[PDB]
Amino acid sequence: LTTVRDACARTLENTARTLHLGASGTEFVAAFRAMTDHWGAARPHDLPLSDVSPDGSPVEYAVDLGGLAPALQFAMEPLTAGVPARDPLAARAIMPLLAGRYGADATRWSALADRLLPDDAHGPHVSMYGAEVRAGAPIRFKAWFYLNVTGPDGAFNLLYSALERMGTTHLWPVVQAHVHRAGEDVPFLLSLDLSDDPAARVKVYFRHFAADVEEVAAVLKAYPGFEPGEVRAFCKVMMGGRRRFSDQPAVTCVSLLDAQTFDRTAATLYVPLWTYAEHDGEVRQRVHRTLAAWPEALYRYDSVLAGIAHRGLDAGTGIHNYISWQPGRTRPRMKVYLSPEMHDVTPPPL
């Protein structure tokens, strides 16, 4: 009888406690509640299926795999029981809430929302929001917009128009340079850090459809730190030795300003995990291989996973959604993105 908003808040709270986030964790859970209060008393079966997780869960949890002071993050979808996910009302309410209660910056959001959050979106989803926190640091909020709201062939037009509205068309060459597999490398999400602070970024997510690992390693080789050998190795290990993204595509995220400057790293590679393995136990084995040099990162990973999984890992896939890879100062930064399997049900035998 537990509601979605309470179930997710409890999972987030337990994960925060596992990561020893302290007071920062408590305030983070309160921000999650602020953002998901509007889900009402809905149970899982009352909400529309969400785009946040491939299994339709309306929340996804992500944790840093390495480093002291791990970050914890969530993404969610504004949703209302009985209302299609593409309806923009819930998403339009999140920004004034974050601006008013947390001092989030709405100026870039407001410049984009009229066109990217329209009343009659073409695609099935129109908005996600998220937050992240580390112990002792302020919570950072973000929004994702869909580049398909005017149909499939409008993503580049919509993206260029968004940069124009934000006064950053000087960033467009970053997008063009990331354009290798024309037609196959496609921007499909735009994210905004909802801060004014100097670190806030606009990011573009690209899909690499029908690519093998070497080709993906070429798109990324242009970004500092993306050593093709290390990138290929990460993909091959996390895909169980597969050399090509057969069905589910590779995804990259490009921080436009950081790709144009020098001091910050500007791209992130996302490897999908639920279709290239027999079950989440095999995915876990690949993470342990990948993190073998850091037994503490693995203990942390296992602790977070155990608090989010509620069935045996070997039963199938659906808990691990993605693992991401970014170059770091001394070591790569990896994150794991996990689903609560909100909608799964197991009836008794007939």
Curated annotation (Swiss-Prot):
Keywords: Transferase. It comes from the Bacteria. CDD domains: PT-Tnase. The active site is at E60 (nucleophile (probable)). Pfam families: Trp_DMAT. It is an enzyme of class 2 (transferase). GO terms for molecular function: metal ion binding; transferase activity, transferring alkyl or aryl (other than methyl) groups. Coiled coil: none annotated. L-tryptophan binds at D51, V52, E60, R207, Y322. InterPro entries: Aro_prenylTrfase, Aro_prenylTrfase_DMATS. Dimethylallyl diphosphate binds at Q73, K142, W144, R201, K203, Y270, R333, K335, Y337. GO terms for biological process: alkaloid metabolic process. Its EC number is 2.5.1.-. Disruption phenotype: Eliminates cyclomarin and cyclomarazine production and significantly reduces the levels of desprenylcyclomarin C. Accepts exogenous analogs of N-(1,1-dimethylallyl)-tryptophan including N-(1-propargyl)-tryptophan to produce the corresponding cyclomarin and cyclomarazine derivatives. Dimethylallyltryptophan synthase; part of the gene cluster that mediates the biosynthesis of cyclic heptapeptides, known as cyclomarins and also of cyclic dipeptides, called cyclomarazines, which have both antimicrobial and cytotoxic effects. Catalyzes the reverse N-prenylation of monomeric L-tryptophan with dimethylallyl diphosphate (DMAPP) to form N-(1,1-dimethylallyl)-tryptophan (r-N-DMAT). This is Dimethylallyltryptophan synthase CymD. It comes from Salinispora arenicola (strain CNS-205). The gene is cymD.
